[PDB]
Amino acid sequence: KLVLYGIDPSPPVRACLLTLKALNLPFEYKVVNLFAKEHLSEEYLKKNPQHTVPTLEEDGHLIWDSHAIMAYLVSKYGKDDSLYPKDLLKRAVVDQRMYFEAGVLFQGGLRNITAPLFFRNQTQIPQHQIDSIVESYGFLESFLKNNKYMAGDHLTIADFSIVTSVTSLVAFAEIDQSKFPKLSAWLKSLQSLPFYEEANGAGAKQLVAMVKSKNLTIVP
Amino acid sequence: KLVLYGIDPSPPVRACLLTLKALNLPFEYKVVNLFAKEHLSEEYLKKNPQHTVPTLEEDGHLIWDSHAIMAYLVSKYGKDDSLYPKDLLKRAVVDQRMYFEAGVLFQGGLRNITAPLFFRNQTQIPQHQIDSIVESYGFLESFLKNNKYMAGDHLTIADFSIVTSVTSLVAFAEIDQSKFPKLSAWLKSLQSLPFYEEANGAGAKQLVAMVKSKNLTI
Numbered sequence: 001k002l003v004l005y006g007i008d009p010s011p012p013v014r015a016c017l018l019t020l021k022a023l024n025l026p027f028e029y030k031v032v033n034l035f036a037k038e039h040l041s042e043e044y045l046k047k048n049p050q051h052t053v054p055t056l057e058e059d060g061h062l063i064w065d066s067h068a069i070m071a072y073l074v075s076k077y078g079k080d081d082s083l084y085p086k087d088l089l090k091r092a093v094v095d096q097r098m099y100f101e102a103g104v105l106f107q108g109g110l111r112n113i114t115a116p117l118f119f120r121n122q123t124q125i126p127q128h129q130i131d132s133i134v135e136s137y138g139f140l141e142s143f144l145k146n147n148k149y150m151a152g153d154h155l156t157i158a159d160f161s162i163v164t165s166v167t168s169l170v171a172f173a174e175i176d177q178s179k180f181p182k183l184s185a186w187l188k189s190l191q192s193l194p195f196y197e198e199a200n201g202a203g204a205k206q207l208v209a210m211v212k213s214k215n216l217t218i219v220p
Numbered sequence: 221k222l223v224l225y226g227i228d229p230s231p232p233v234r235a236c237l238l239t240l241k242a243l244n245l246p247f248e249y250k251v252v253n254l255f256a257k258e259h260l261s262e263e264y265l266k267k268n269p270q271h272t273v274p275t276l277e278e279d280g281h282l283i284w285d286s287h288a289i290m291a292y293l294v295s296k297y298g299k300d301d302s303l304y305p306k307d308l309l310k311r312a313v314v315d316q317r318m319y320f321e322a323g324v325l326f327q328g329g330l331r332n333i334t335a336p337l338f339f340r341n342q343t344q345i346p347q348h349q350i351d352s353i354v355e356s357y358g359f360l361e362s363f364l365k366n367n368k369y370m371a372g373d374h375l376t377i378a379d380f381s382i383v384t385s386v387t388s389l390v391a392f393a394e395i396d397q398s399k400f401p402k403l404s405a406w407l408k409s410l411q412s413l414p415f416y417e418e419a420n421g422a423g424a425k426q427l428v429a430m431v432k433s434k435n436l437t438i
């Protein structure tokens with residue numbers, strides 16, 4: 001019986017949700033309230049010493065990091081390899097896109113703001129940070145230059161990982177459709193998935209709301 | 221025919237160099253000098269629109285990101301899977317450690333200080349960024365609780381990835397051996413591979429010297 005530990009404002013938890021729904025997998029969900037420091041409990045640290053969400057539990061085994069989890073799920077459960085191609089050159093693109101999300105989008109763009117924001121009430125955001133988010137939208141627009149989805153011609157876990165961060169980063173910088181038409185189209189396409197709302201949309205809305213309620217300032 | 225594009229001070233370049241050497245693969249090393257903005261030319265942007273190093277070229281096909289390159293090299297060229305185990309659960313640990321390196325160590329620890337430093341000449345490092353680095357050492361210490369290497373009982377590309385970052389982070393935050401004994405032992409187990417200096421040491425030192433010449437303060 002799969003168990004996912006998380007809370008839905010979290011982008012990587014949402015990426016796992018997307019992927020479990022895409023694989024038509026049932027699972028138990030255990031909420032870990034980061035705002036009440038539940039991830040810092042002795043019990044949770046034994047599951048995941050990095051004290052992050054998501055964690056996946058399967059027959060006693062604990063796996064963390066959304067990208068590891070997503071790859072594991074497709075590899076283990078996928079009817080075929082559509083969501084995570086076995087072809088090594090294809091896999092290298094999916095992998096690259098996910099490492100891009102981990103580093104550039106999630107740490108560099110999002111957590112770089114949200115950690116001081118919710119922890120230290122740092123409500124002033126330097127323009128150079130917003131510039132970096134917009135630079136990353138540009139990189140995503142480049143990724144899509146000759147492909148319908150982030151890593152090629154079909155939907156993969158790279159799309160799921162990337163969309164979770166993109167739909168959070170828009171709390172700080174909107175995506176200019178005139179600059180980033182492909183990124184814009186791609187997002188609407190992901191938004192069309194039957195499981196999109198339940199896996200990503202719901203949590204994204206709650207995170208965007210939390211951010212908006214903090215009344216941020218961009219400093220030139 | 222393998223070509224690696226990079227510069228030695230870059231940790232993810234060094235991770236690829238460590239892996240190439242471990243697999244004993246011939247390659248051409250094309251220097252792309254970030255300080256001369258060689259990564260921003262039309263030619264390089266065609267290879268990698270992210271304008272990062274490393275980039276790997278294999279018979280004309282281009283791939284980038286150290287972690288993706290390392291997984292690709294072991295998968296394609298490894299005589300066996302020891303450096304990147306095929307077992308899904310074992311792979312999941314290797315994968316997680318590499319994503320940790322990408323986000324927490326490299327972006328959150330290293331590039332967080334080196335971008336302001338090299339782009340904005342910010343030589344004053346907020347004490348809390350050093351703390352965060354030390355916290356990351358602590359996470360690495362935990363990863364080593366029941367295992368001699370980062371992802372289990374043998375050397376993997378997770379070790380290569382993490383060493384490159386750790387050796388760069390040392391430039392800002394010394395490792396206290398009384399707090400992180402397992403990490404300290406682990407780092408010696410890497411510093412000892414016969415190909416360590418040529419693949420990681422040289423460029424790690426160069427980055428240290430660049431960092432030192434900037435005369436930092438906390």
Ligand SMILES: N[C@@H](CCC(=O)N[C@@H](CS)C(=O)NCC(=O)O)C(=O)O
Binds near residue numbers: 010012039053064066
């Ligand atoms: N690379 C990890 C990132 C996980 C992460 O940083 N999650 C945040 C929530 S969005 C978290 O658990 N923060 C609490 C903490 O780090 O203490 C993944 O992809 O799962």
Ligand SMILES: N[C@@H](CCC(=O)N[C@@H](CS)C(=O)NCC(=O)O)C(=O)O
Binds near residue numbers: 100284286
């Ligand atoms: N996730 C990438 C990170 C690559 C990266 O950020 N490399 C730096 C050098 S250490 C770089 O190319 N900086 C130049 C730039 O980003 O413009 C990887 O693992 O290869």
